[PDB]
Amino acid sequence: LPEETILDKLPKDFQERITSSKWKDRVEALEEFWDSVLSQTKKLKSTSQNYSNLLGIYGHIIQKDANIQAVALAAQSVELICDKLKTPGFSKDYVSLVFTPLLDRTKEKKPSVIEAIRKALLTICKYYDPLASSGRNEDMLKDILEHMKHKTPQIRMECTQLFNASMKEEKDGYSTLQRYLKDEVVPIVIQIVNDTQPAIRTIGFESFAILIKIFGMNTFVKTLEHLDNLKRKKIEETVKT
Amino acid sequence: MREVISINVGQAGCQIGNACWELYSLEHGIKPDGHLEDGLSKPKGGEEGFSTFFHETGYGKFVPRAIYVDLEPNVIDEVRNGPYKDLFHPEQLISGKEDAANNYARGHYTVGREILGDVLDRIRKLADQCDGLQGFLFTHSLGGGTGSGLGSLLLEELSAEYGKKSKLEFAVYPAPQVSTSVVEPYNTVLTTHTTLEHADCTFMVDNEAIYDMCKRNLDIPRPSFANLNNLIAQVVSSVTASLRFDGSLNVDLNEFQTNLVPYPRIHFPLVSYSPVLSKSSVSEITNACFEPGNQMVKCDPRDGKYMATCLLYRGDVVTRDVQRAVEQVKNKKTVQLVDWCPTGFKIGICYEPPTATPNSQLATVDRAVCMLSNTTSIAEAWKRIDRKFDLMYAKRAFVHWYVGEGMEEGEFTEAREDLAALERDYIEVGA
Amino acid sequence: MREIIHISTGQCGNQIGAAFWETICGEHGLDFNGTYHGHDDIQKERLNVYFNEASSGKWVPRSINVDLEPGTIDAVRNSAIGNLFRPDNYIFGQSSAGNVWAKGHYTEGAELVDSVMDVIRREAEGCDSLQGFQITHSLGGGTGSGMGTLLISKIREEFPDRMMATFSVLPSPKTRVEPYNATLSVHQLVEHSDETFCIDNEALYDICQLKQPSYGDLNNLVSSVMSGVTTSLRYPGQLNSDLRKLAVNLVPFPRLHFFMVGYAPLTARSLTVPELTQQMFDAKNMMAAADPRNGRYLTVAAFFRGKVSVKEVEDEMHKVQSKNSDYFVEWIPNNVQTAVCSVAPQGLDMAATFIANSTSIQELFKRVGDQFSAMFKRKAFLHWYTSEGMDELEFSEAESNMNDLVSEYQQYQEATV
Ligand SMILES: Nc1nc2c(ncn2[C@@H]2O[C@H](COP(=O)(O)OP(=O)(O)OP(=O)(O)O)[C@@H](O)[C@H]2O)c(=O)[nH]1
Ligand SMILES: Nc1nc2c(ncn2[C@@H]2O[C@H](COP(=O)(O)OP(=O)(O)OP(=O)(O)O)[C@@H](O)[C@H]2O)c(=O)[nH]1
Ligand SMILES: [Mg+2]
Ligand SMILES: [Mg+2]
């Protein structure tokens, strides 16, 4: 599988266009570069190729742009670059450029836009496990957890679901998860389980059910007894699933 | 002295509280200042049972042992600005910023849970000023959001922090003539469930009964809450009279339990009061307690069976006339008394005359009586609210408001199954 | 203090909003300079719900006027009511939504949202205890519909537990893309609105046609309603004092929160309570092209104003409920909440406002769905929408969603036991 370059294939006016006040310039600029290049890419070259600017641009669009179409495009491109560059190519320097913007823009509801954001988030987390036993990606873990306390209920849902995915897909130990457990994870999980909206309480039930499946039904017994009898029974029921 | 702390929750509890403490203050010769009326030296009640409800500061002022709690400042601001603004210490009146919006869930799980810290604190502060705290009087509505949600929440905590202390509940049962919400049957069933184990004695007050009493007896074509509360305060005053003055029965919050409840769950006495007359004899008022139009709950006392009874007389009363009146009820036979009740009716007299406030429509009477009877006919109150509950819940109407406020939908079922059990337990114990 | 933040979006929303503010100004005894000249205390009590006390003693509306085009906002500027409006509460772009939902929701409107959001954030900071928002707009246009529903969603993201009331004007067959804009907005309202007052522009026209009316004549009618609708919110008080208490009482199910509204008296000598009541429930007095008799009342919030006895009103409302018992569902005890307020409108003795959650409102949606499907099957005008960032499945979503709404309203129409 040959490796390609993409930085020498940008539109010569990309910088002026992408930074244009006209939405159409930004959308066309992204869509063009995607169709003519990123879409037809199978492998990338990390050698003597710096993606910082490009990813920084994307990351900026994802976080602050109002046109959700351009947001969906940037997230799709970031996901393309990351999956086709893999590791150690896509460095933590690149992760820090696009991870927080994506976590911030999980507020979106539009199916195609949030799907792009989820894919990007899952692809980066795939190559960088937030719960790594090395404890190298704890910064991302703090990021997810801090977002699971966000004022916006949509972000709490999307990030807690992302957190659950990290727990489920973890297959290399749970040492990083144990440290943040009683002092960070459980206090946040309890807030989710006790949320006003039932759609969010359900996600909480799943989280506690997973924590129970891992660390055992016993180690939380003092915590569970404080919940509502029905919230406790819900988790008890979810654990079976 | 054996102090009694009076807690009021929600608009109904607080407005009834205003009518009660206005009357209490008059019956003990205390002005809205907290000071004694001109030329009194000491308040009328004590030295005896006056200290039970009031606190003597030391500089000539008397303060009600009361706590007002609401999740909106509106009702309590009327107290803070009214003529009785100085009666209660400002710390005794607690208000939030946003109410429970006719929703038991945000009174129990959401907003009512924000103020809970403050309330329990003031209660502890008031309880620490007591040489021998006797218990609590809990006054609230079961139809509101704060009365129901924060109320039951408060009873739950009170049972925890004060396990050895008794709690008498005054619950305002909802009526359609003066309803403020469509989901009142939901709140009522939920409150009954979560307070069925955190109350030693519960005195139900059907607003439909009080409304009809004001309409029939006092001849008011459309009674306001003020009319209702004036009558209610007259009843509550009569009940607490033995505690606040010299009585021979129910002179203790614990004697209500002892004399009325056989089993813990069966703690819902039917209250009767007589006479109820507008400004415009013992035998007669005693017989009136056993007739349909003199109860605090819409029902026919002639139906169902009596399990226990406490006739509390007030004012100009001589033991001969009451001994006659009581045996008159037994002998000619309104019994209708369960075969397993040993001693039948218990009598109590408080020679202090009953009082009516000038700013009301009630006539001052020489003597009055109040009967507290644990009868099965009160199950009608739960049956009527049960049909209301079932009709709506069969379609899960308005439930998304509760489930959307942190409550699990299962509690609707558990609460309804519990009330169905309470109904069965009542018709079953009358057997 | 339970403040409410008003938002006027679009030409319609800004002209109806203006008429509204201009109306309630008088009922609270306020000059158009903000100074209070009322002769009652009731007018001053719940005054801070809609108005902000400027240090000068004057009272300024808590209104935010938003329009992608500077046209109508400039008309409101140099108007009578334009004097007490806060200058920096005027938000406006240079472009226009061109009467297409897409330009308001994704494109040009999406670029102006953050500028208005700053102002509502500043307003919300100056609230003792903000209860919610109220929005005036047309569902037929591009700005009011598209940007309005965008603003609603973005408002809920930042204020999740604050109430969301909406005054939405539905278009009548009388500008060829209104079924598109309307259906796409209804899909947003059902998801992100707590309370929606449906003001069919056909019903307003029909009623004014009092003996062809202009938009101004329609606006007075709308303004009169909104004044009546918000009587519980602006005066103390017992029934439905909050937007929240009202929602709990009017909304049995989450996506059934679209209310019909009736008002009386209209006409062109003084009325009796029975006449005021019978006129109110009349189909000729409904502000929506739909006969309530073709459906059932799930809930009702009747508001009476002026010199009337509480008893006479309750006795009459009860009599109507008993007589017309078939037009009320039996599985909701005490559907109808009846309130009374001493403060009358101006210049009237007494008046009655009628908020209903009737199932017959399905006729409104069912009508638009037919016009929507008529165009959509031909794929008409789609270019003007998909060129902005929309997809066809978004149209099909809104269509089938509004279809489910009709099915739902119809489902409880027939509910038994
Ligand atoms: N007897 C009597 N009943 C009242 C009074 N005020 C309200 N109620 C009843 O109480 C029920 C509603 O509850 P609220 O009194 O508003 O109590 P709340 O907890 O403050 O209700 P929220 O608005 O949710 O805070 C209604 O069914 C009324 O019939 C009153 O002053 N006297
Ligand atoms: N009742 C009433 N309806 C109005 C009024 N003005 C506009 N409309 C309705 O609004 C619909 C179109 O939206 P508009 O309010 O005109 O304008 P917009 O929604 O802001 O869209 P833009 O053109 O981008 O500004 C029309 O179908 C009208 O029926 C009004 O003053 N009163
Ligand atoms: Mg209240
Ligand atoms: Mg316009």
Residue numbers in the entry:
A (entry chain C): 319 to 559
B (entry chain A): 1 to 280, 288 to 438
C (entry chain B): 1 to 174, 178 to 212, 215 to 216, 219 to 275, 282 to 430
Any passages from the paper?
Microtubules are dynamic polymers of αβ-tubulin that have critical roles in chromosome segregation and intracellular organization. Evolutionarily conserved proteins in the Stu2p/XMAP215 family regulate microtubule dynamics by promoting fast microtubule elongation. These essential proteins use multiple αβ-tubulin binding tumor overexpressed gene (TOG) domains to selectively recognize the growing microtubule end and promote its elongation. A recent study from our group revealed that the TOG1 domain from Stu2p binds preferentially to a ‘curved’ conformation of αβ-tubulin that cannot be incorporated into the body of the microtubule.
